[PDB]
C-alpha cells in the first residue's frame, strides 16, 4: 500500500471548496479515491472542513449500510486459521474496528475482500443523497425564456435533471415530456414541425440562431 | 527509506499557514506523515514557524507519553545479539536518542517495531488537545437565528461539535439534546411535528426553504 499523495489530498480539498456539492464532485471523489483503503477514505472525508451538516448525513448513511452488511453477512465465532483472515464486520469496512494491515490483507486476499470498494460505494451513496438534496431546482421550473438561446435552456435542463432527485424512470422520460413543452413559442413551433423521435442534435440544430 | 518530497513539506507548511489549528489539519498531518520515521516526523514539526506556544504544548504531551512508554516498556541491560536490535526507549521513539538507521531497523524488523506509528500517535494526541483548546465556541452557544437557514445552523452546529472538548459521550447525545432545542421557533414546530428518531436528512428536508 502506497499513501495518498499530497497532490491527491490537495485536489480533493480544493474541489470541495470550489464545487461544493455539485454533481461533478462525486466522480472526482471516486477517481481520486481509487484503490484506496478504508483508512485512506476516512482520511479524505476528515480533511473536509465545513459542510459538517453533510458530513454528519454521510455518517448516518454509512451507519445504515454497515448495519445492512451485518444483517446480510453475519459473523461467525471461532479462531482464525493461520493462513487466512477474519471476515470484515460493518465497522471493519468503515475503518472503525479494522487496522490498515487487515484492510490490505482483505483487499489482496485470494479471493480478495474489496473492503475499500464496498466502503466507497457507501460513501458515494451518501454523497449522492446530499447532492440531489442540496439542489434547489426541479426540472419542472426549467422553462426557456422569450429570448433564451435554445442551447442555454437545454444546458440548464440537463444540468437540473442530472442533480434532480425524482428517479431514473422520470429522468428517462423528462426529455419527451418537458423539453419541447417548456420551450418558448417560437422555438416550439419548429420542434413540433419535426415530428416525435427527433434526436437532441436534430432539435438543437433546428432552432439554431433563434 | 525514501525522503520527504519537497511537495510534502510544502503542503504541510502551507496548511499550517492557512488552516492554523482547525480540526481538518490533523488528518492531513497524518496523511502527509504516512510511513514516516521519527526523524521525518520531527522534521515536519520543526518546519512550522510561529505557533510556538502550541509546539511547546506538543513537546510536553510527547514527553508525557514517552514517560508512560518507559514505565510500561522498561528497558533491560545486556548486549544486543548480532541478528537483532535494541528496544526503543521513550526518547528513541521521539527520534531524540535514536538514529535514522535504528528507526528503519525497528520499522522493518520481524516482528517490526513501528516507532513511527507510535510517535505519530503521540503527536496526534498532542495536536488533538491543541485543536479543541484553541476552539473559542461551545456547542451550547450554537443557536439558530430568526432567519438563519436550517442548513447553515446545522453546519455551525457540527463544526463546533467536531472541535468541541467535552467528551464523545456528550457529542453522541448532543444532536438529540441541543439541535432541535436551539432551532428558531418556526423550524422548531416542524421538527417536533416529526417525532423522535428522525434522521438528520429528514430534519433538514422538513425545514427546507424556511
Amino acid at each position: 500500500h502506497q499513501c495518498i499523495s499530497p497532490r491527491t489530498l490537495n485536489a480533493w480539498v480544493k474541489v470541495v471548496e470550489e464545487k461544493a456539492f455539485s454533481p461533478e464532485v462525486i466522480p472526482m471523489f471516486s477517481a481520486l479515491s481509487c484503490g484506496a483503503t478504508p483508512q485512506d477514505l476516512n482520511t479524505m472525508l476528515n480533511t473536509v472542513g465545513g459542510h459538517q451538516a453533510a458530513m454528519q448525513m454521510l455518517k448516518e448513511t454509512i451507519n445504515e449500510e454497515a448495519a445492512e452488511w451485518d444483517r446480510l453477512h453475519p459473523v461467525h465465532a471461532g479462531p482464525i486459521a493461520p493462513g487466512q483472515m477474519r471476515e470484515p464486520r460493518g465497522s471493519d469496512i468503515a475503518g472503525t474496528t479494522s487496522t490498515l494491515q487487515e484492510q490490505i490483507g482483505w483487499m489482496t486476499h485470494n479471493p480478495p475482500i474489496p473492503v475499500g470498494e464496498i466502503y466507497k460505494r457507501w460513501i458515494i451513496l451518501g454523497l449522492n443523497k446530499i447532492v440531489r438534496m442540496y439542489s434547489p431546482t426541479s426540472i419542472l421550473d426549467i422553462r426557456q425564456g422569450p429570448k433564451e438561446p435554445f442551447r442555454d435552456y437545454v444546458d440548464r435542463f440537463y444540468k437540473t435533471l442530472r442533480a434532480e432527485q425524482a428517479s431514473q424512470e422520470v429522468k428517462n422520460a423528462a426529455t419527451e415530456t418537458l423539453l419541447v413543452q417548456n420551450a418558448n413559442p417560437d422555438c416550439k413551433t419548429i420542434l413540433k414541425a419535426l415530428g416525435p423521435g427527433a434526436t437532441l442534435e436534430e432539435m438543437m440544430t433546428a432552432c439554431q440562431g433563434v | 527509506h525514501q525522503c520527504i518530497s519537497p511537495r510534502t513539506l510544502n503542503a504541510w507548511v502551507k496548511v499550517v499557514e492557512e488552516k492554523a489549528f482547525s480540526p481538518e489539519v490533523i488528518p492531513m498531518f497524518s496523511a502527509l506523515s504516512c510511513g514516516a520515521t521519527p526523524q521525518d516526523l520531527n522534521t515536519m514539526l520543526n518546519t512550522v514557524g510561529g505557533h510556538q506556544a502550541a509546539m511547546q504544548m506538543l513537546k510536553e504531551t510527547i514527553n508525557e507519553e514517552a514517560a508512560e512508554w518507559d514505565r510500561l516498556h522498561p528497558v533491560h541491560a545486556g548486549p544486543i545479539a548480532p541478528g537483532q536490535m535494541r528496544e526503543p526507549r521513550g526518547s528513541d521513539i521521539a527520534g531524540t536518542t535514536s538514529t535514522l538507521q535504528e528507526q528503519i531497523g525497528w520499522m522493518t524488523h520481524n516482528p517490526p517495531i513501528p516507532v513511527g506509528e507510535i510517535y505519530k500517535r503521540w503527536i496526534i494526541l498532542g495536536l488533538n488537545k491543541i485543536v479543541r483548546m484553541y476552539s473559542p465556541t461551545s456547542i451550547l452557544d450554537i443557536r439558530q437565528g430568526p432567519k438563519e437557514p436550517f442548513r447553515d445552523y446545522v453546519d455551525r452546529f457540527y463544526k463546533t461539535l467536531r472541535a468541541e472538548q467535552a467528551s464523545q459521550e456528550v457529542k453522541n447525545a448532543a444532536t438529540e439534546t441541543l439541535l432541535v432545542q436551539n432551532a428558531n421557533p418556526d423550524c422548531k414546530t416542524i421538527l417536533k411535528a416529526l417525532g423522535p428518531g428522525a434522521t438528520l436528512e429528514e430534519m433538514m428536508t422538513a425545514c427546507q426553504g424556511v
Binding site: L45, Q56, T96 | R162, Q168
Partner: peptide, 12 residues
Amino acid sequence: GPLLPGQSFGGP
C-alpha cells in the same frame, strides 16, 4: 453504527 458525531471518520 460505527461513525459517531463530532468524531473523526474511522473512530478514535
